[PDB]
């Protein structure tokens, strides 16, 4: 009995890859089909060895190795659309490695993943990762507030939003966390009781003055 | 039978290593499988001697030996990502050890861990450990107050934090403590209530809180 017959009837939602360490890798697509395959190897109807990988946790398995041997590295995510050639999205304006010591990292990333053949390295730009998050946040017409600092930015969504302003903001972030991850940019959706959605002003003798962004907000009596 | 069949059906979560003191060490990953493996050696279905090691428990045993024979040593953590060649993160800006007295430490540390083949000692910087922690604390948008002194800094978080800040704070400290450890930088979360809820007050240099229309409070500078 081969491997792709002991799984379900639909033989296209999974993807069996041959390993290099004499193992066999099955490529699921979500956490629901992961427990479908892990029940097979746990009930024990397969003779040889087999492992289960996943997008959200193999990006965690080689980030635990990565923040020990290569600290202060700026990267976003590893995409696994074709598992024989992964793509590593580095930062261009924050990484200072030459061509000789970037080829050592690709051969060292090869030893962590015995199913992969060659890891592809490209240098993604750093302001494009902030422009898509800003122009995508103005497109939904959401009252936000940007805080620029060194080595990552952050966007705060304060205020008493209603159900449509929560549903549009929550839906855009999860379609953005899939692409770039949460290493650089972090979203800060929070509900407080102020009808003024985030902003704050002080008033004297000339009009209103826009205050510097702080954590304290005035609670609204209306 | 041999040990790798006496464990569970999933032959992937444990990895047995033969020791130098005529033992066989198994390297688990959390406390849920160490009690699984220690149940095996306790019920007694194995003739020889064996042990179950861990990342954090072995990181406290070889720190008790180190503060007896080598006190006033500045280090952070020993990383156990590959259990046959561990990496020791020593500090740079706080010790004056030469190359000749680093080989005595790297050869006397091998005899305490019989499973390892060699220890790779690297000298980490001291400002990047606190520069990634301060910059990591602004990204979560938390109010704080850094107090610097000689041989360690600390960050104190105060205020009426809401429920999203006490979940982003636990997900950040446990990701930083997992890498560097709690030897150099320590956080102190303490939460108090707001004295200013329905009260009117003046802020700035001469700050005071009006607890009632006829009651003033002059706080500490």
């Amino acid at each position: 009995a081969e491997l792709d017959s002991l799984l379900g009837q639909e033989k296209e939602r999974f993807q069996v890859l041959p390993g290099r360490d004499k193992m066999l890798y099955v490529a699921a697509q979500n956490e629901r089909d992961t427990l479908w395959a892990r029940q097979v190897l746990a009930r024990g109807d397969y003779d040889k060895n087999a492992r289960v990988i996943n997008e959200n946790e193999e990006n965690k398995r080689i980030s635990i190795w990565l923040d020990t041997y290569y600290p202060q590295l700026a990267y976003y995510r590893i995409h696994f659309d074709e598992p024989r050639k992964p793509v590593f999205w580095l930062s261009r304006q924050r990484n200072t490695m030459s061509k000789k010591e970037l080829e050592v990292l690709s051969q060292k990333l090869r030893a962590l993943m015995p199913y992969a053949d060659s890891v592809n390295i490209t240098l993604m730009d750093d302001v494009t990762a902030a422009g898509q998050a800003e122009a995508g946040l103005k497109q939904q017409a959401l009252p936000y507030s940007r805080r620029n600092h060194k080595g990552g930015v952050t966007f705060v969504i304060q205020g008493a939003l209603d159900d449509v302003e929560i549903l549009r903001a929550r839906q855009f972030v999860d379609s953005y966390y899939r692409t770039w991850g949460g290493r650089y940019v972090q979203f800060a959706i929070e509900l407080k009781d102020d009808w003024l959605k985030g902003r704050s002003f002080q008033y004297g003798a000339e009009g209103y003055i826009k205050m510097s962004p702080g954590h304290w907000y005035f609670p609204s009596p209306l | 039978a041999e040990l790798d069949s006496l464990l569970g059906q999933e032959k992937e979560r444990f990895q047995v290593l033969p020791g130098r003191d005529k033992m066989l060490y198994v390297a688990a990953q959390n406390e849920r499988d160490t009690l699984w493996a220690r149940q095996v050696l306790a019920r007694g279905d194995y003739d020889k001697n064996a042990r179950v090691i861990n990342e954090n428990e072995e990181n406290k045993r070889i720190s008790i030996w180190l503060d007896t024979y080598y006190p006033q040593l500045a280090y952070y953590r020993i990383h156990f990502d590959e259990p046959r060649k561990p990496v020791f993160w020593l500090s740079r800006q706080r010790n004056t050890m030469s190359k000749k007295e680093l080989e005595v430490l790297s050869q006397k540390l091998r005899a305490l861990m019989p499973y390892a083949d060699s220890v790779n000692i690297t000298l980490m910087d001291d400002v990047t450990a606190a520069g990634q922690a301060e910059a990591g604390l602004k990204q979560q948008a938390l109010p704080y107050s850094r107090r610097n002194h000689k041989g360690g800094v600390t960050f104190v978080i105060q205020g009426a934090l809401d429920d999203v800040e006490i979940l982003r704070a636990r997900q950040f400290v446990d990701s930083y403590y997992r890498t560097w450890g709690g030897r150099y930088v320590q956080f102190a979360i303490e939460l108090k209530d707001d004295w200013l809820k329905g009260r009117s007050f003046q802020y700035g240099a001469e700050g005071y809180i009006k607890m009632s229309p006829g009651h003033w409070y002059f706080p500490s500078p």
Partner: peptide
Amino acid sequence: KIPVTGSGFVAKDDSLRTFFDAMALQ
């Protein structure tokens, strides 16, 4: 434990006597 950065007077439903007495130093 008074989290604000600048200088100023915050008034929550004052009765125009404790408000204008606070402006009696400027």
